[PDB]
Symmetry: D2
Subunit: 474 residues, 4 copies
């Protein structure tokens, strides 16, 4: 077993204890990652705080450079990383490589967006005559040490989207990847080491969050917690954060609202691509379709067919639907499938599980009484809820505790815009599937789908504070 080390204060370290990582699809052993001790966690943080001042004293262009190099390295090794990554989280090899390319892109972009952050000069005279000679020179500054924590479905991409924005602004990082993905995370950590950033600027932490999780979050060394993951852990992070700044990208139950005048063929393709992408293990996936009755039968039919075209199989074969992350997860989905069924839902696709590989199932005639109408599966299961009016679609849509994104399919644009304003989500895509898509675009969840606004530009803004220097003109 290859025993990986954590990049800490400019060195690769192991821990007295470790964790063995396996392949969800095969079961093969990929290696082990350290299981840090609070003492070791304390070292990572003590290291970062000590390097922060020097890292911040650098010019924006110097930090941008280190970051571009990192991206250069990731592009160079997009094959090695994708290889492991693909195996570590059972993600299609091609898409796995793509995630690394997406990561490189986000890093380069953040580097360039961040070196152009500008300040403001406010006039006292705008508020009171007596203060006309008083001005405020407001410049942005880092919050200090940022604790980045990534999910299993994008251990690298959702690591960089937090790290790059943090570093360019002058913050130091403590990256805790998901255990089931800790290898991929350490591979990313490799690029940062090779790039040669100063020791302590970028560090990693591994170990089941189920034992050092609260510790790394509650540690007073952290000035900001940027997290993507379950809504459950999200809640707790919010409470442990106290009054400290936080970034939370949690679950979602994105609805696809289909009006009578929609382009059913296009709607169907988008709903297919979004719902089943990566077996439904995507936060922004199309997890529920709210379709008008008059066009339901036809739409459903289109979906069904296109579902059959999906490729069921293993990661190395770039199959649309691959084995779910783990057994627990698959069991969860099955529970939702059984509940939908017993209550009347009609499965138009075959319900079938083999290992942790669940075949894509299309549930029609789903009602708000079924768990599947609400709970986030994170498995290939798409329920279809029929409505008799846009207004109903709005209610059912907002009734959810989730509000990441929503889709609206219709040809009546002005109306879609009106409906978008009413949806309790961050982003509404018109005649397209939901997606974080275009990382410069803002990405945020409403209600229990998140806290804070992501998207390169917004992430930088989020992980920086302001320092205002006021004086009077003579």
């Amino acid at each position: 077993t290859k025993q990986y080390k954590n990049y800490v204060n400019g060195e690769w370290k192991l821990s007295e204890n470790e964790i063995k990582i396996y392949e969800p699809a095969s079961g093969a052993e990929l290696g082990s990652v350290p299981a840090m001790s609070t003492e070791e966690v304390d070292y990572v943080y003590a290291s970062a705080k000590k390097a922060q001042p020097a890292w911040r004293a650098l010019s924006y262009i110097e930090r941008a450079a280190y970051l571009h190099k990192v991206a250069d390295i990731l592009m160079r090794d997009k094959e090695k990383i994708g290889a492991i990554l693909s195996k570590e989280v059972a993600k299609g090899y091609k898409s796995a490589v793509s995630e690394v390319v997406r990561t490189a892109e986000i890093i380069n972009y953040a580097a360039e967006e961040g070196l152009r952050m500008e300040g403001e000069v406010l006039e006292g005279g705008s508020f009171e005559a007596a203060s006309k000679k008083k001005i405020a020179v407001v410049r942005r500054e880092p919050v200090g040490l940022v604790l980045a924590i990534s999910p299993f479905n994008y251990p690298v991409n959702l690591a960089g989207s937090k790290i790059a924005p943090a570093l360019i602004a002058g913050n130091v990082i403590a990256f805790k990847p998901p255990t089931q993905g800790s290898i991929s995370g350490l591979l990313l950590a490799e690029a940062f080491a090779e790039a040669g950033l100063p020791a302590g600027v970028f560090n990693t932490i591994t170990g089941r969050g189920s034992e050092i999780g609260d510790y790394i979050v509650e540690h007073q060394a952290v000035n900001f917690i940027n997290f993507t993951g379950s809504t459950g852990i999200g809640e707790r992070i919010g409470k442990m954060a106290g009054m400290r700044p936080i970034m939370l990208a949690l679950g979602g139950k994105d609805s696809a609202i289909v009006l009578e005048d929609a382009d059913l063929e296009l709607t169907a393709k988008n709903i297919i691509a979004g719902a089943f992408g990566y077996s439904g293990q995507r936060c922004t996936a199309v997890k529920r379709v709210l379709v008008m009755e008059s066009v339901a039968d036809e739409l459903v039919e289109k979906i069904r067919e296109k579902v059959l075209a999906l490729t069921i199989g293993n990661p190395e074969d770039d199959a649309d639907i691959t084995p779910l992350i783990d057994t627990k997860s698959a069991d969860y989905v099955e529970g939702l499938i059984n509940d939908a069924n017993d209550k009347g839902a009609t499965a138009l696709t075959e319900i079938k599980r083999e290992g942790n590989l669940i075949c894509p199932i299309l549930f029609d005639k789903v009602t708000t009484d079924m768990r599947l109408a609400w709970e986030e599966p994170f498995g290939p299961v798409l329920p279809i809820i029929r409505v008799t009016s846009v207004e109903e679609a709005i209610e059912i849509s907002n009734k959810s505790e989730y509000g990441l994104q929503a889709s609206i399919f219709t040809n009546d644009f002005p109306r879609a815009f009106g409906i978008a304003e009413q949806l309790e989500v961050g982003t509404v895509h018109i005649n397209n599937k939901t997606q974080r898509g275009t990382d410069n675009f803002p990405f945020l969840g409403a209600k229990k789908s998140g806290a804070g606004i992501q998207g390169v530009k917004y992430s930088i803004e989020a992980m920086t504070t302001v320092k205002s220097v006021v004086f009077d003109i003579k």
Copy 2:
């Protein structure tokens, strides 16, 4: 008993229980405010939530017109409200009227700043050539129900600063003034009532924070908590907030760094005003002078001299130093004073307390051993700490858990900017006492001094989220 009432969903309501409020200076009864029950709190939030949609559906200019109407009413009644506020929190009459005027100004300014908030249009083609025809139309939206909590030292001003920004953006309000100052808060409600805002858009909650504070804060109807008060309560707010956004303005121990080249007269004049305004009961007060040894003697004598010119007395006489808010505080301050004296600090004034009226006291040669060096007094007690370099002054300054604002008196502006970057504070004033001064300016606190960035423009930004609508161009 003159019984004041809360403004709830367009009507004035008493509660089965009340709390008698007395003048801190004279001890005379001022009236009573309701001691709301949780049921009543529930009805307030329910009211605000039910009113939010219609309030948001209005145009910005319409919401603006309402705020201007409130501001005009406050200006018209500046003598009325000022007179009572003066008595309720033992604040000079003139500065009390002044507090009201400043409130109308904030209200007016928020109305205009907010009616012209703009959205952005992002290019998908900026990130990937493949999305060149995809654009993101991003517009600001209200977060919902905002809970505003003001402090005793500015029950009206620090209410308007949260309320107007919140309301202009389309949020609805629940205003909880401090108990000692609740009558002033209810007088402010009068202005919103007379202005005619739709029932539910604006509401008040009164009652002992030690008995309904947790409840009004932990309530899930609250989408955002904007609070100004003690760090202790502030911390609890942070945790009770969970993942919900917050605005915290807390304690402060603003240091005034005085270099060898500082204009000692200007420095003493500024330090006297900032340290003793309203008897030191200010968050942005100059609460500790870090001055180079070589100019200490001269500076200290200028302070001592000006301190003795401060008037001591009653609010109606517009005295500089008035009785402290209550007995607990006067005790706490006197204890800080005695601890200094007993530990050896060099007192430049006689230690004197008449009831809750503590005469301005100045302690020179205070050491890091003395409580007065760190604890926020919120009384007219000013410590002087002699340093032998800017490096040390910066260390002492940052040693504090507070980091609201800082003053730097020197003639070397480039150096002042260098020092400013090192000081862990929100704002740094050069050759001027610290101050929230000019409300368009950002107002924030580092470390334990706060969370979030205030100042009209920033408050609106803080209490709004973004709604991103994405679509492809044909």
Copy 3:
């Protein structure tokens, strides 16, 4: 004859020579305006320049107060001023009052928009590491003396649209209204004089442009020339401006592109309103309908009918169509009508001219060989051109030397956006008549329709410049 006086350096001055103004509709004498000498113009500019420094020395808020005051005065006198305006430019009384009200709104809006202009702080370290301590504090400053020249169709509104934005930023104004409209212009001046703006900050000039026009514009005292008029004069001013900044709002031949999926009823209402508003004497009027052959017939009929419901008559009666500004215009318009009629266009209405009152005429099947297809009429004449594709409509549209605004009537917005990108105009309205509408919006013309970007905020940035103060932080 009531002798009107120009307002110069805080004084109401007459001129040795006067120009009599007659009511276009009745021919009745309305009064007379001064006929300044080149030297009297020199005194206007000398005063302005002399008062500029002290005007700029004021705080932003103080200048805003003066403007707000002017606005209030105009609201109070809307009827008084409106009545004269109506008589002077043959604009319907009600819409004449509307111009005044709209003017106060712009004045007020510019006031609040202008006091909120902010500065920027640029980091040298964004460009080169060696300059990481160098920062640029950039703040806006006025350009100096601004010459504002308004048009006859909005002598007051297109006056304030330039004046207020210019004054708030700290510039001084020399306002030259149109001779036929000067009385209204001077009435506006009254509102400034009464507002009590410092002498010389605001001034007026009157005289035949065909005599002192080149002078007022060529005078080197003028720092910025903000103009709205004919493309002919507009170009002369362009060359006379030299390298000095300018604002040109010129002619337009806004086209209304009607696709096959357009709501024809809504399409017809908008075409009629935008085409015949003020008898077509609008720069943003609908002046040519490019409609797909298949819906041509149906659309044409809807229009023909709506045109007939238009009231025709005198301004005092608020008639839709009133006498044109002068006999020259009426002659020219008739000439364009006869050319179309003689060349074969299909008139859907009768040709009828009574004095300078031309009845609303509609020509269908207008070909590219007919003058009415390109020349801006500025009369109640509307050409309807049939096309066979969107590509053709786009071609006919851009072939024009004009490019102010355009309208697209369709049920497909994404396509409308793609077409808008192709149209060489400033603003594209979807399912709505073209319009300068909502003055905070940008207003600009491509090709020969204008230079510079108007709209309150943009006007302010146009008539201000930047002052960059660069220094190094120690």
Copy 4:
């Protein structure tokens, strides 16, 4: 002879005629450049206009990629190009290399700054309630064909600073380098050619500016003229621009204001570097020192010494002072030296001219009566003017018809700022020599020093317009 070709429509073309360019220092034949006919210019534009649409159709990131490549080419061949450039305009070989590096830097930066241009969404409801559902989606668009004309002192740098911002935004360029510098210009063109930018996107025009000058500018294909050169040709470009947008970077007489409390050694070093850089052949440069009598003798002496340390000679030997660009300029400068001399000026340095090489001369006691006090020499001659008050220094400084930049040397910053507000210039450097310094900073001149605001970000803004799409939400 070494004959260069123009890069037209993606091909290298010669003309029936040509112009031979000789090394300003050795008089050797560097080579020849085409002397295009008007018909050949017509082809360059017809080609550019033809490629424009497809160039714009590309995504922002794609256009940025092309630019980055061009920058890469330049860095690879920096020595190859610096060699030729150094020879073409007789400038130190090292700085000739730096100019190329600076060019690559601006190009890379422009591509990144420009790929992030964002639009705005304006709310109708901000101006009137009736238009609350009306919004304006405002996006930036390129003006079309941009004509770039660079100066002799920076044939490469001041070309890229116009081309890149222009191109990234979607415009096509027609680059007209100065005859004396056309070889370098064409060398740059090679990088663009090797980068593979679509034919017609980037084109070059060579020929005597006195022959084809007015033609290329007046040509109607040009939508924008971005020019850097003499105030003389600038004024003409102004008129010939008509109403089309223009960017003018003309000459300057940057004053260096020295106060009594300045750091004379620091001041002097700065003045030496700024006034004599590139033999003073720079638009931004200390061309006049306005120093308080009090420290004039001391400052003068320091400058005097530092002048003697300056090297004299060939560009190949990186001498500080090189031969002026041509006989004419040297004749002109010498004339200024004589007028100043015959009027009383004291030359503290040997007035010596050998060929077109003038030794650095420092003139003391220069009065406002000497040509040298006002005219831009573009030679190694520094006049010194003794003033007795800041007020005077401000008055003299502003009496200049130039207003590019200024320098204030003092330790009283609040005062420096106050003074900077009064100086009629674009940028004011405190305790630093004037410079375009750090290209992201704004760069502009007042009065006769320019028109438009440069600096990467501002250049892009300048060469783009706006397209506004308005519609009503439903």
